[model samples]
Target: ATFTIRNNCPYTIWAAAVPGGGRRLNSGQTWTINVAPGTAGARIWPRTNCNFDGAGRGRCQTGDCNGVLECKGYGQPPNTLAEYALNQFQNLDFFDISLVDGFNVPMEFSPVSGSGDKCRAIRCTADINGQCPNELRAPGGCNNPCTVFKTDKYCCNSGSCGPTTYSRFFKERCWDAYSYPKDDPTSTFTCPSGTNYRVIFCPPG
Candidate 1:
């Protein structure tokens, strides 16, 4: 499957993907990645306010991975994530917009082709940066409870946890996101096989 990542933000953004590497996207620009079938635990995210050297080594205000243009690992917290597992569980594709690592850009992840109306589009378009509480506020974006507090109450590492005030804050704004680790009921979306997807940052109306 192919995923088209589009940037509509006014400024430049560094797009990062674990398996697909990264790219520099200016306003109205786009980057697309082709992945083989049965790909799992894949992520797509964006970084902002970055300045790289001629050798493509620089740090982003957020989502910096060792100052490398080509990401070799997951980004820092507070970066909005588009997460998916292709062709799983009886030939269905599972996907979600996750705030578990925090949130940065306003995003929309949806199937663009090869799925029916049953393939619902999910977005985290809330003004999370502007409205983030002080405790969870970061330089470039909003931090989730798990990132700031780092407790089992928010992280759910112990396998059982419930929504707290912070997760509630996120959930109330972006209901489609995985507000906490176990926030699965309303956070997951699905499509059938052979679907192409789109990930939009600062999505247009």
Candidate 2:
């Protein structure tokens, strides 16, 4: 039930919900719940240059809080970590990028006619192939964020959302590989060493 809006452009973007019946949300910003029964969908009107990245992540810069790459844009998109009760409302996530184009948040999980299957997790690539979309272990070990998209299912044994580890001896090794430094914005300790960084999605149970 989570969708991310990312700004791929270089300029900062602003997004606001249309005055009608809709909600507005920003990274780490206060959220206003807009609810109205029976609206087919919600729309977000962008006031600046913002868009969603291919990986369903949002790119936004609130201000001079961090640095260029470090401080620019929300550290992370709304990961559905903060859940908003939607039983009575259909939320619309919006993105504004660079004053040129506007993008809508992917309204995830629309029941497909009679398919009877719901899309649960979504990532840029199935394998986290060093970067993304690594197909099923092309020959050697599969290496793509997209390829190992099931890390949660593999490591947790339960469909739980949490951090991944990478230590050989750690029970949560697969979940730890992605642990980045949060304290020091300029700390190497946040991310793993290039040579030492390695990951494989936890095999599906």
Candidate 3:
């Protein structure tokens, strides 16, 4: 299977992949990357407002990783996430666009070609930054309550916590995204094998 990354935004975005690393795309540009059939827990995200040197060394206003153009690992907070696992539990691809980290740009993740009852497109198209709570607001994006509060209630780091009023705030805005941990009832989706996926950034305003 493969994942096509498309920049539908008005500006450039540096796309980062956990196994594949990163690529720079201008508006309307597209890049394709391979995903192993059984790969699990893979993620991709967009880095905004970046300035890289000749050696591909730079930082981004949001979704930056160690100030490098090529991210060796996951980016910092305030980044919307496109996460997936290929060929798990009888050839199913589980995927979702998450705001558990927070929101930067709008996103859509969907199957370009696939066949199954579960092959459905999932998106987080809200302009969450515009409606972000004052306390969770950041420079280039809205911060998740967990990132701002750092408490077990919001973070769900204690291994057992449900959605609080803070998380409900995010859920009310982006229902398809993970407003908090354990938001699997509607946030996660699954598709059959041999599916080629596409990740769209900005998603037509």
Candidate 3 clashes: the total is 0
TM-score of 1: 0.96
Sliding window of 10 residues with minimal summed lDDT for model 3 = 113-122
Q: What tens-digit string does per-residue lDDT give for candidate 1 at 94-167?
A: 99999998988999999986466558789889889999999999989999989898889999999999999999
Query: Largest lDDT belongs to which candidate?
Result: 1
Between candidates 1 and 2, name the one with more favorable TM-score.
1
Clashing pairs in 1: none
Q: How far off is residue 5 in model 1, in Å? A: 0.7
Question: What lDDT tens digits, residue by residue, belong to model 3 across residues 1-205?
Answer: 8899999998999999887889999999998999789988789999999988999998899999888887888999889999999889988889888888988998989898657766877788876888888999987999888899999888887779888887888898888889998898878888887889999998864
The candidate with the higher lDDT, 1 or 2, is 1
The per-candidate count of clashes, in order, stands at 0, 43, 0
| TM-score per model over all chains | 0.96, 0.21, 0.95
* Candidate 3 colliding pairs: none
Question: Per-residue alpha-carbon lDDT of model 2 for 172-202, expressed as tens digits?
Answer: 2222122221211211111111111111112
